[PDB]
Structures are given as C-alpha cells and as structure tokens.
Structure 1
C-alpha cells in the first residue's frame, strides 16, 4: 500500500562560505544570483576566533534557497559534474543528502575574469506529502513514526531516478 507516501524534493539550499568580508564576498553573491534567479541573503559570523581571523557581526558567507521545478533542474546540473556517483556516507539518518564542487564554472555561466573562481556547496531536503501538520501555526503537532523517511529509502529513490551509483 502506498497512496500518499511518495517522496519528492521539498527544497534545495546551496551556500558559499568565502570566509572573509569585503569586495570578494560581494562578487561571490553576484555569482550566485544568476544561478538561481533570486536575490541571495547574507550571513553573519556568530563566533569570534583569531585563528580564522573573523570577529562577531561580520559577513562571511552567502546562501539562497529554491523550490519546485527550478530546484529539480539545478540539482540535475550538479549531479552531471559528479557523474552520478555519491558515497554511501553522504546520506544522513533523516534521509537527506548533499555534496560539493570545487569549481563553479565547470557548468557554464560564461566565465568572466572579473568575478573570479568560487567553490559551492549543495544540499537538498526530502519530504512526503502532508507535512504541513508540523509547520502550521494553529494546532501544530508532530508527524507519526511510520510517515518519516529513513536512510535506506532515500538512496533507493536516488538510484532509481538518476540511474546513479553509490560507493
């Protein structure tokens, strides 16, 4: 039986951690806009460590989130670089997965020497239909034990959809 227990992509969120504030970070945020078509959001350093040379309340990273068919398309481009091979340890106990790429121009953005080269991180969230129960404001509750995703289920979905392999 499986009427309303079909997996889908809830959202895909991807970030770049430049690690230091200044004009370099602004260029990184400039890069990320055309990839998704949405304005990105900055992040602030919550620690203050001298080894990394960062203090409190200084911007050190950017990120953005996408949903729906747009997330489906962008995820496909990332797996192409990874040639559809992921390691078994890339899937968490909850049922999510992610990866990273060293070069952001490996897929085409029509490289420009002014912006530079950045490395980007990928992460996406699985879900099942009718998960609003845990996020509506009124009469919020907790989803059942049988209705939550496990590690084995999500890797089976990945192999069947993209014909990829796991190491």
Structure 2
C-alpha cells in the first residue's frame, strides 16, 4: 500500500564558504545571484580563532535556498559534473544527501577573468506529503514513526530516477 507516501524534493540549499571578508566575498555573492535568480544571504562568524584568521561578527560565507521546479533543474546540472556517481557515505541517517564540486565554471556561466573561480557545495532535503503537521503554529505535533524516510529508501529513489550508481 502506498497512496500518499511518495517521496519528493522539499528544498535545495547551497552555500559558499570563502572564509574571509572583503571584496572577494562580494564577488562570490555576485556569482550566486544569476545561478538562482534570487538575492543571497550572508553569514557571520560566531567563534573567534586566530589560526583560521577570522573574528566575531564578520561576514565569511554566503548561502541561498531554492524550491520547486527550479531546484529540480539546478540539481540536474550538478549531477552532470559528478557524472551520476556518488559514494555510499553521502547519505545521512535521515535520508538526505549532498556533495561538492571544486570548480564553479565547469557548467557554463560564461567565465569572466575579473570575478575569478570559486568552489561550491550541494545539499538537498527529502520529504513526504503532509509534513505541515510539525510546522504549523497552532496545534503543532510530531509525525509518526512509520511516515519518516530511512537511508535505504532514499538511495533506491536516487538510482531509479537518475539511473546513477553508488560506490
């Protein structure tokens, strides 16, 4: 039986950790806008360590999240670079997965020498329909044990959809 227990993509969130503030970070945020079409949001360093050369309350990273068909398309471009091969340790106990790429211009953005080269990180969240129960303000509750995704189920979904392979 499986009437309304079909998996889907809840959201895709992707971030760049430049590691140091300045004009370099601003250029990195410039890169991320045209990929998604939305303004990104910065992040601040909550620790303060001299070995990494970062202090408190200075912007060191950017990220953005996408949903719907746009997330479906952008995920396809990333998997093309990975040629649809992922390692078994890329799937968490919850049922999510992610990976990273060293070069952001491997897919075309019409490279410009002024902006430079950046490395990007990928992560996506699975879900099932009717998960609003745990997030509505009124009469919030907790979803059942039988209605949550496991690690084995999500890798089966990935192989069946993209015809990819696991190592």
Query: TM-score range, shorter-chain basis?
Result: over 0.9
Post-superposition Cα deviations, 1:67-123, rounded to whole Å, max 9, x if no partner, equal 000000000000000000000000000000000000000000000001000000000
Aligned residues: 167
**How far is 1:54 from its partner?**
0.3
- Which residue is 1:32 aligned to? 32
Query: How many angstroms apart in 2 are the aligned matches of 1:15 and 1:2?
Result: 35
What is the CA–CA distance in structure 2 between the aligned matches of 1:143 and 1:84, rounded to whole Å?
32
How far apart are 1:130 and its partner, in Å?
0.1
- Deviation, 1:126, is 0.1
RMSD in angstroms over aligned alpha carbons?
A: 0.2
> Tell me, which stretches of 5 or more residues in structure 2 are unaligned?
none
Q: Secondary structure at the match of 2:30?
A: helix
Q: CA-to-partner distance for each residue in 1:108-166, whole Å, 9 max, x for gaps?
A: 00000010000000000000000000000000000000000000000000000000000
Residue of structure 1 equivalent to 2:94: 94
Q: Distance in 2 between matches of 1:43 and 1:21?
A: 11
Unaligned runs of 5+ in 1: none
Q: 1:21 deviation in Å? A: 0.1
Show structure 1 runs of 4+ deviating over 4 A. none
Question: What is the rounded CA distance, in whole Å, between the counterparts of 1:23 and 1:153 in structure 2?
Answer: 44
Using the TM superposition, give the Cα deviation of residue 51 of structure 1 relative to its aligned residue in structure 2, in angstroms: 0.3
Q: Aligned equivalents of 2:136 and 2:110: distance in 1?
A: 42
Deviation of 1:8 after TM superposition, in Å, equals 0.2
Give the match for residue 120 of structure 1.
120
The normalised TM-score by structure 2 is 1.00
- Counterpart CA distance in 1 for 2:86 and 2:132 is 30
TM-score by length of 1: 1.00
